[PDB]
Amino acid sequence: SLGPQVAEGENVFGVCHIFASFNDTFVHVTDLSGKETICRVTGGMKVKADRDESSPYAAMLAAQDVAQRCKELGITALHIKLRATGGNRTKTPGPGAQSALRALARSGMKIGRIEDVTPIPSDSTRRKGGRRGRRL
Amino acid sequence: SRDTLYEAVREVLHGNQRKRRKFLETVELQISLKNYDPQKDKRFSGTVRLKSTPRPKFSVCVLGDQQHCDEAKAVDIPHMDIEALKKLNKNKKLVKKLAKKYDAFLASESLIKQIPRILGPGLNKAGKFPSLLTHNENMVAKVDEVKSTIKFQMKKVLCLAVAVGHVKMTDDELVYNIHLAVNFLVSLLKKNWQNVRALYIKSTMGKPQRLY
Amino acid sequence: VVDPFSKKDWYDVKAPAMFNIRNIGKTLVTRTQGTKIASDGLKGRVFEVSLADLQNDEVAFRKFKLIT
RNA sequence: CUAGUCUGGCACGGUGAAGAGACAUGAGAGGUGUAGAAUAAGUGGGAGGCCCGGGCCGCCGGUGAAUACCACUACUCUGAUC
RNA sequence: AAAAAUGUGAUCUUGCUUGUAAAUACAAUUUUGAGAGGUUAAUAAAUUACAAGUAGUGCUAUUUUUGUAUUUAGGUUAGCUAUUUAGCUUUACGUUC
């Protein structure tokens, strides 16, 4: 783990596929292409209580421990491709999006290109749940 | 630990490449020493006895006083009984020469009751240390050490040497002792896992050139 | 009894003469080991890279792809 | 007990290319305890012998085993193999 | 001090590996935060007469005077009170021994 680079003017780029549904937090650093994987950690690794694994604190406890293991190989900059559950279910992002992204802006990393990469359809298979709703 | 052979060890009639010097060359035998420790008491040292004259000759002294005085007058050397033992003790210190005037010695069996005192680090550090692992007895071995008999010693840093004849010497003195300095320098054996590798020719002076 | 980010050596990536900047980035793969080569698997990536960073100062909304 | 069926081995049964070894035969480097004018590897070495009337490395002072030419092992790097 | 020397073939005993046999905690710490399961699961260490083999050493001995030497004898941390006389901390100077 020692990459040869010009010491005083080059930061090694990357990309992170930030998955953010309501029931878990995920962070996943990869190469430029996305094919390999370098430093992955969830909210489940950090916090241990079924209901509060995806909470904004259970999303920030994961992102510091990305950047701990992400500063020992020696990466500085990263591209970004955020999510939200998607498909034929909710496309509004979850509570591990900003508390997972703003945490690594304090934990020794640079920020680059951002967008959404939810799955979205042109149109869909019938959705889980009835005609009559999910009563509650 | 087995060689045999005796197939046809004729053919030293190309041996002019040995003697190139003006003087007569001391022809020899020496196998390189595998299967061996330095410091120990793994005592690999008999005293193999040849038949006819390889001629190891250095100035011998008879320190014996029972049958070793009578039977060491056959070689015929002016015997000196009590002023041979007293000569090495404080006589010639301020006179510039050393007090010996000897070379070889006896590993004492006749005077075995007068043996156990001083003589340790003068002879031992030199390696002229008189033993019966090399026929230093000087009585019947006065007719053998000076002329016939031989050994291979034991020591720390792993070494060997032994003779058979010369290049004065003829084809009678070259091959018929080679028959007795191979049977007897093979059986002498620790189930040595065959140091039987290859046993090399030798003279007085030079560089590498191999044989079995 | 192993560290998995030793068996990974840092190689380089390039872009064609029609776009401006030549040097994109880097990528990592395992050595010639068992029965797989480090130049056989490394021959079909996709780098979904923009244009702004590929040029001096452009409209950034266009992207591109560049397989090995 | 057993004819059929499943599975291993051993024979008929051979050629090439490349990846990684074992293991050897034929070579080139390969040696600084104290000390000695001098990179202390081990023994029978040894005051002696080669050439081109003469030279030289030494005997010598010395350390706990000494410089020429006959013998290769302890020990460490080099790469081609019918 | 001086070690000469007749001195088991001129001096000297010292290297080393092993068997039995005999001696190693305040309060702890981990454990078991617990009267005990597991003060675990460590340790160190430690010495020698003999039996085969070494770095080193090759394994015996009279004397004379010793130091005229009494078979060579006593001591201290000396702390201070007031100008000297006079007195006397067993060594607390965390406090007491």
Curated annotation (Swiss-Prot), chain A:
There is a cross-link at K46, K48, K91 (Glycyl lysine isopeptide (Lys-Gly) (interchain with G-Cter in SUMO2)). The modification Phosphoserine is found at S1, S124. Residues 116-136 are annotated as: Disordered. One of its GO terms (biological process) is translation. SUPFAM superfamilies: Translational machinery components. It holds the Pfam family Ribosomal_S11. Component of the small ribosomal subunit. The ribosome is a large ribonucleoprotein complex responsible for the synthesis of proteins in the cell. Part of the small subunit (SSU) processome, first precursor of the small eukaryotic ribosomal subunit. During the assembly of the SSU processome in the nucleolus, many ribosome biogenesis factors, an RNA chaperone and ribosomal proteins associate with the nascent pre-rRNA and work in concert to generate RNA folding, modifications, rearrangements and cleavage as well as targeted degradation of pre-ribosomal RNA by the RNA exosome. HAMAP family: Ribosomal_uS11. PANTHER family: 40S RIBOSOMAL PROTEIN S14/30S RIBOSOMAL PROTEIN S11. This is Small ribosomal subunit protein uS11. It comes from Oryctolagus cuniculus (Rabbit). The lineage of its organism: Eukaryota, Metazoa, Chordata, Craniata, Vertebrata. The gene is RPS14.
Curated annotation (Swiss-Prot), chain B:
GO terms for biological process: translation. Disulfide bonds: none annotated. The gene is RPL10A. It comes from Oryctolagus cuniculus (Rabbit). There is a cross-link at K113, K156 (Glycyl lysine isopeptide (Lys-Gly) (interchain with G-Cter in SUMO2)). The modification Phosphotyrosine is found at Y6. The keyword Cell membrane does not apply. The keyword Acetylation applies. This is Large ribosomal subunit protein uL1. Belongs to the universal ribosomal protein uL1 family. The lineage of its organism: Eukaryota, Metazoa, Chordata, Craniata, Vertebrata. It is found in: Cytoplasm. Keywords: Acetylation, Cytoplasm, Isopeptide bond, Phosphoprotein, Ribonucleoprotein, Ribosomal protein, Ubl conjugation. CDD domains: Ribosomal_L1. The modification N6-acetyllysine is found at K86, K101, K113.
UniProtKB/Swiss-Prot annotation, chain C:
The modification N6-acetyllysine is found at K14, K36. There is a cross-link at K14 (Glycyl lysine isopeptide (Lys-Gly) (interchain with G-Cter in SUMO2)). It comes from the Eukaryota. It is found in: Cytoplasm; Nucleus; Nucleus, Nucleolus. Belongs to the eukaryotic ribosomal protein eS1 family. Component of the small ribosomal subunit. Mature ribosomes consist of a small (40S) and a large (60S) subunit. The 40S subunit contains about 33 different proteins and 1 molecule of RNA (18S). The 60S subunit contains about 49 different proteins and 3 molecules of RNA (28S, 5.8S and 5S). Identified in a IGF2BP1-dependent mRNP granule complex containing untranslated mRNAs. Binds with high affinity to IPO4. Interacts with DDIT3. Part of the small subunit (SSU) processome, composed of more than 70 proteins and the RNA chaperone small nucleolar RNA (snoRNA) U3. Component of the small ribosomal subunit. The ribosome is a large ribonucleoprotein complex responsible for the synthesis of proteins in the cell. Part of the small subunit (SSU) processome, first precursor of the small eukaryotic ribosomal subunit. During the assembly of the SSU processome in the nucleolus, many ribosome biogenesis factors, an RNA chaperone and ribosomal proteins associate with the nascent pre-rRNA and work in concert to generate RNA folding, modifications, rearrangements and cleavage as well as targeted degradation of pre-ribosomal RNA by the RNA exosome. This is Small ribosomal subunit protein eS1. It comes from Oryctolagus cuniculus.
